[PDB]
Amino acid sequence: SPSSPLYFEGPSYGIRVSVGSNKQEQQVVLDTGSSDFWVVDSSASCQKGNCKQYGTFDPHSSTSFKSLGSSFSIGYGDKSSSIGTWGQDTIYLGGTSITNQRFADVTSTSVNQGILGVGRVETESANPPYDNVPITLKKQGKIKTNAYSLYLNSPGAATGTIIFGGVDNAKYSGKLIEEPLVSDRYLAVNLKSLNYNGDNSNAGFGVVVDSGTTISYLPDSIVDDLANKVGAYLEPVGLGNELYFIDCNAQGSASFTFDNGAKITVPLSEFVLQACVWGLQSSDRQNVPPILGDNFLRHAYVVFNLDKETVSLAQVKYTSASSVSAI
Amino acid sequence: XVVXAX
């Protein structure tokens, strides 16, 4: 199965991939919450500091690049956005390559690096839809099933892993528990309940299982009481946003129960992020769908099956042992 | 942090 290391950057995990005849190196966010692959053009205008520390792409020096001429724009949940023009080229990832893959060459962005969106075609910022990277990996015979497994690995590990088309059965406990999707567009599953260090709360709503989000965002119906219980407090992050902070010097775990008996336990240290922000935030206040992000996902082994339209979950097992099978 | 598509 093709597979890639995932490099912890702090807010995100990067995947390395090269583009074009001259194999121009990029490190881009591995994002299960979006569906388009895009790179930072060498001549782009970054809106916020240096968005060119994780590679750039110069279309003019790849003899295999072709612009498609159509414009690309996308907005993300954190209000960052990108503008560019679609093109196609050869892409190297996972120890393999795909030819004539559509991706955007971005000429202005407020994101800090490019993004490899590996989500469903329904969240592509395109009309008509097109074959994004997971679809092409299957179509070109690199994998038999449009599916991938995510192992962000422990806090402090340097590198996690994504396996395209395969599953490492050594890296979880119990059985993978398959969940159907509950969104028309996202890789989202039902969250049944949340027991945060003994304060238990009904949920019963969908959550996007999102590698491209740093922390986790849930409705006020859950978060309000927890903020009171844990001492989380709103402060301006300013201007006119605010987030919950928490004392950096604040035992136990938070358990997330899904359908079909799946339960993921997350140590409470995952909820103090260096001033420290709380690792729970409000999806209502931040104007995003509910999301379980990296602080959750480090504690799960997750199989995203885009053919079957399922997400399967099990408690992660941190181990060098490996037993990979095709999904 | 970041929160990745609408």
Domain boundaries, given as residue ranges, for chain A: 1-165, 166-327
Confirm if A212 and A288 have CB atoms less than 8 A apart.
Answer: no
Cα distances (Å, whole numbers) of residue A303 to A33, A91, A150, A171, A263: 14, 23, 6, 12, 15
Query: Among A225, A182, A224, which residue's Cα sits nearest to residue A205?
Result: A182
Query: Phi and psi (nearest 5°) for A172?
Result: -150, 160
Confirm if A316 and A301 have CB atoms less than 8 A apart.
Answer: yes
Whether A75 and B4 lie within 8 Å, measured CB to CB: no
- Which distant-in-sequence residues (6+ apart) come within 8 Å of A271 by Cβ? A230, A246, A254, A278, A279, A280, A295
Fold classification of A1-165 is Cathepsin D, subunit A; domain 1 (2.40.70)
Confirm if A279 and A296 have CB atoms less than 8 A apart.
Answer: no
For B2, the closest of A36, A119, A212 (CB atoms) is A212
User: What is the torsional sign of CA A319, A212, A46, A85?
Assistant: positive
Confirm if A239 and A245 have CB atoms less than 8 A apart.
Answer: no
CA A90, CA A113: separation in Å to the nearest integer?
20
Cα distances (Å, whole numbers) of residue A68 to A20, A63, A65, A84, A128: 15, 15, 10, 11, 13
User: Which ranges of A140-270 does DSSP label H, i.e. alpha helix?
Assistant: 220-230
CA A203, CA A166: separation in Å to the nearest integer?
31
For A11, the closest of B2, B5, B6 (CB atoms) is B2
Token pair for residue A324?
Answer: 């990979």
For A12, the closest of B2, B5, B6 (CB atoms) is B2
Number of Cβ within 10 Å of residue A310's Cβ equals 17
Question: Distance from A46 to chain B by nearest Cα, in Å?
Answer: 16
Fold match, A1-165 / A166-327: yes
Query: Phi and psi (nearest 5°) for A107?
Result: -110, -10
3-class secondary-structure state, position A244 = strand
Which residue, among A78, A81, A296, would best test binding to B if mutated, counting the most B CBs under 10 Å from its CB?
A78
Token pair for residue A43?
Answer: 């001549």
**Long-range contacts, A52-55 (Cβ 8 Å, 24+):** A53/A112, A53/A113, A54/A14, A54/A26, A54/A27, A54/A28, A54/A112, A54/A113, A54/A114, A55/A24, A55/A25, A55/A26, A55/A27, A55/A28, A55/A113, A55/A114
Dihedral angle over CA of A95, A96, A102, A108, nearest 10 = 20
Class of domain A166-327: mainly beta
Query: Among A307, A3, A32, A4, which residue's Cα sits nearest to residue A147?
Result: A307
Residue of B nearest to A278 (CA): B1
All residues of chain A having their beta carbon less than 8 Å from the beta carbon of residue B4 are 12, 29, 31-34, 76, 115, 117, 210-213
CA A11, CA A95: separation in Å to the nearest integer?
25
Report how many Cβ contacts below 8 Å link chain A to chain B: 55
For this structure, is A199 an active site residue? Answer: no
Q: What's A80-146 look like in SS3?
A: CEEEEEEEEEEEEECCEEEEEEEEEEEEEECCCCCEEECCCHHHCCCCCCCCCHHHHHHHCCCCCCC
Please report the resolution in angstroms: 0.8
